[PDB]
Amino acid sequence: MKTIQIAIDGPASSGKSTVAKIIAKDFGFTYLDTGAMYRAATYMALKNQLGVEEVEALLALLDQHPISFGRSETGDQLVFVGDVDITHPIRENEVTNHVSAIAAIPEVREKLVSLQQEIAQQGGIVMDGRDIGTVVLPQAELKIFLVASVDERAERRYKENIAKGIETDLETLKKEIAARDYKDSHRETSPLKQAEDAVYLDTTGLNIQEVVEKIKAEAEKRM
Secondary structure, X not given: OOOOEEEEEOOOOOOHHHHXXXXXXXXXXXXXXXXXXXXXXXXXXXXXXXXOOOHHHHHHHHHHOOOEEEEEOOOEEEEEEOOEEEOOOOOOXXXXXXXXXXXXXXXXXXXXXXXXXXXXXXXXXXXXXOOOXXXXXXXOOEEEXXXXXXXXXXXXXXXXXXXXXXXXXXXXXXXXXXXXXXXXXXOOOOOOOOOOOOEEEEOOOOOHHHHHHHHHHHHHHHO
């Protein structure tokens, strides 16, 4: 087998983390999340006040940063950028706010993409994201496309908001998702439309284990 990448795409994917995780847990592939990639990039931005306004500089720099991931002794995927293992500084919300503002830049995404390839360069890595339709996929042995319905996902979110100690209304998520879902399904850049050879597989309100098997079978057989 040597080593091979495992990319997963979809409108939302209600089993990308678990699936991609379980897979690498058995095969031993390095797990990578498009989010962390942007986290490391945005992190440096705020670190050296490289606001989006500095696309030129931040661009050449983003590529200069020897970014990479690694599993912490305590089973914690840390983000390594600039030769500094940072897993805490790479928050979610704070990093998201800057990540969204940063990612907005075209030159940024392009460079950040090159990094994704640098990670899987050695081979044997499971990656999952939304902008993985025309970039790393083309060079990804195994590529799956988990599809779902706004209703299904929108529901899973409503609960997660409740169980967390809140009382978010469904009607709220339903609408909110309708706006984003559209804006995402009504653009041009990073057009999904199913990758070149993206394995189509929809799992609506279906068990998670059922998905892991589906992919596993596709990989084992392909091998």
